[PDB]
Design an enzyme around this catalytic site. Sequence first.
Site, mmCIF file in Angstrom:
data_model
loop_
_atom_site.group_PDB
_atom_site.id
_atom_site.type_symbol
_atom_site.label_atom_id
_atom_site.label_comp_id
_atom_site.label_asym_id
_atom_site.label_seq_id
_atom_site.Cartn_x
_atom_site.Cartn_y
_atom_site.Cartn_z
ATOM 1 N N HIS A 243 22.603 -10.105 -25.740
ATOM 2 C CA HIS A 243 23.124 -11.017 -24.652
ATOM 3 C C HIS A 243 22.649 -12.439 -25.050
ATOM 4 C CE1 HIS A 243 22.725 -7.039 -23.022
ATOM 5 N NE2 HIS A 243 21.608 -7.280 -22.356
ATOM 6 N N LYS B 145 15.444 -15.667 -22.879
ATOM 7 C CA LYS B 145 16.444 -16.614 -23.361
ATOM 8 C C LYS B 145 15.961 -18.052 -23.206
ATOM 9 C CE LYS B 145 19.927 -13.322 -22.434
ATOM 10 N NZ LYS B 145 19.751 -12.964 -23.869
ATOM 11 N N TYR C 209 26.009 -17.095 -26.764
ATOM 12 C CA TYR C 209 25.691 -16.775 -28.155
ATOM 13 C C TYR C 209 25.932 -18.007 -29.024
ATOM 14 C CZ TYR C 209 26.360 -11.961 -26.385
ATOM 15 O OH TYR C 209 26.288 -10.789 -25.668
#
Lengths: 147, 152
Positions: free
Chosen positions: A95, A126, A79
């Site tokens: 996440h 991501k 994060y």
Amino acid sequence: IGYLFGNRVLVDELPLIEAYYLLDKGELEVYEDDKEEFLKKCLTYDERFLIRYKAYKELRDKGYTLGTALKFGADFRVYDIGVIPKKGKRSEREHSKWVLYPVSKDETFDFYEFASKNRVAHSTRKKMLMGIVSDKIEFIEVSWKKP
Amino acid sequence: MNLRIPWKEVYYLGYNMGNYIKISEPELLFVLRNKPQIKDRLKLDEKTIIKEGVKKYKNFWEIYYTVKDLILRGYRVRFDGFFIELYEKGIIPGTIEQDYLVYPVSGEIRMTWGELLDIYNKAIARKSKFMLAIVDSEGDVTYYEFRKLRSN
């Protein structure tokens, strides 16, 4: 304030990497029965411990928050600074925001491995985060261009 | 190789030297395969150029396939001897700075992580964005852009 039991440290259980961070920072004491002692035990369990820890310590010190990414086959999920793991019903990207692969500067890889690392990052929506470790540590973010 | 031919007629590959074009073998393979008229016009052989190319670059097929992929997508490119310079759609090479420097590799290539960073640092020293191109055994290409992480 901690007790070493196998691959966990029980405090009030913590993984060895998180227990090492706090011992190194100064807010934790460990004990087998009753530091180079604890590191030797950590490396007995995980040969890549120092590689993983150096990257882990670096980012957590800089305000980043890390959690395991093992279910995806990566070392850590990361994060961004100003965090906030929990948030509400989410949903700061969930996440969120980098899959991290702590890696040694002298370790070899083929591009099947490289493509694999990016594919799992992509599968979680991501950004593959490669952290080369040596005397220094450099963090490389890889993006899948189309093209 | 040095060809006395208009630059537009070799897909603006290579370098326009004024009186001739300086073009690499993997780039020339593309023009020979897609503009076969050039073979007889400039008297060049497909197999010969492959032979010279694979002893010059290691690496040759991956440059060829990456050049081919990018031109067929509507971009303009040139091989600088190490990187492929990639220019945005519309513009001709050398007019401005390239958008990306791209390094082509195959899956089987084994490398150190520090060596990959050196390659990336080489593009950074050129003040340019970097893209890795991985080319499979069918000659299809996938691209990955690199950035350094720092806020700070």
